């Protein structure tokens, strides 16, 4: 029938696109070809063919074919149900791929995640969706699990936690009913998934780094919102050591400390660690940040260093806080 045909000649349209796309790695090329399709509602298609393709071939494939999809969805031509359609399609035969590709969850993570960048599915939403087809599984966990796994390397469980928090999400809602929640989280090593002026500034001194403000604009910042007791309090120097510390972690594996950046602080830092007591205080929240981050090895010796080396924090607090 035309219909049949339809769909058939979309898939080899597809495949020539997606072959090309992940050869060239021509992205405005990509989305442009697939906006010429103008076939909207047939869009799962390209979506259920880009995962099948690639499920196999390699992280890079995956992570190139993820990104596409993305770049789709944020174009506007791409719609998310079509997205979902085109998935289910595949997850629906996840959990029986997983005898002959024991990774197959892994893999999938790796195609949906991009998904989750700016301009894409809220994480709440995502999650809640992407795991209808394993609501039948019982598998939502195995999806979901490989996903967090995925942004913890790229940003820290600690962030991702907050993230899962602010979608409101619930294991609850993805676990067998009657499953201790205390129990799982804890085996799967997930227990990081479990406003106050004082948070509020943890929010703000990030942004503020985010977006690469000079030193001068932060100390304007501070001065401009925060009280006198407020600017001399242990929580901004906490806060302050937390957001530029973590404005200095360069997402690879393993982790690394962007000396440069820490160097270009020094100034920021200093100033509101000036004594011993809040050096201490600030090595502490150092090493709370370290350890949301898996106490990767050695990463807190290279902050040690560079904080030294740096004339942020001297010898005797170093000495107080071995203890």
């Known amino acids: 029938s035309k219909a049949a045909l339809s769909e058939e000649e979309l898939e080899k349209k597809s495949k020539a696109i997606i072959e090309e796309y992940l ?15 103008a076939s909207p509602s047939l869009l ?39 997205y979902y359609q085109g998935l289910y399609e595949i997850l629906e035969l996840a959990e029986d791929m997983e005898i002959d590709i024991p990774h197959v969850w892994l893999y999938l993570a790796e195609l949906v995640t991009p998904i989750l960048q700016e301009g894409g599915v809220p994480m709440g939403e995502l999650f809640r969706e992407i795991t209808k087809p394993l609501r039948p599984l019982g598998k939502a966990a195995s999806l979901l699990l490989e996903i967090l796994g995925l942004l913890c390397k ?7 936690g907050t993230l899962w928090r602010e979608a409101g999400l619930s294991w609850k809602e993805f676990l067998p009913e009657g499953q201790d929640i205390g129990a799982f989280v804890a085996e799967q090593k997930v227990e990081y998934t479990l406003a106050l002026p004082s948070e509020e500034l943890n929010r703000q001194l990030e942004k503020l780094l985010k977006e690469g403000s000079s030193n001068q604009r932060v100390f304007d910042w501070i001065e401009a919102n925060l009280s006198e007791q407020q600017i001399v309090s242990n929580t901004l120097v906490r806060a302050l050591m937390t957001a530029v510390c973590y404005s200095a972690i360069i997402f690879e594996t393993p982790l690394r400390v962007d000396v440069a950046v820490l160097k270009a602080r020094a100034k920021l830092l200093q100033k509101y660690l000036c004594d011993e007591q809040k050096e201490l205080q600030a090595l502490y929240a150092l090493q709370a940040l370290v350890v949301t981050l ?14 030294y080396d740096e004339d942020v924090v001297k010898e005797d607090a170093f000495y107080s806080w071995e203890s």
């Open 23 to 37: 050869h060239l790695n021509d992205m405005k090329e990509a989305v442009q070809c697939v906006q010429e399709l």
């Open 44 to 82: 799962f298609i390209f979506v259920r063919h880009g995962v099948e393709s690639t499920l196999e071939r390699s992280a890079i494939a995956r992570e190139h074919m993820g990104q596409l999809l993305h770049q789709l969805l944020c174009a506007g031509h791409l719609s998310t149900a079509q």
């Open 154 to 160: 790229s940003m820290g469980p600690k962030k991702v």
């Open 294 to 307: 898996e106490q990767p090895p050695n990463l807190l010796r290279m902050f040690f260093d560079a904080l």
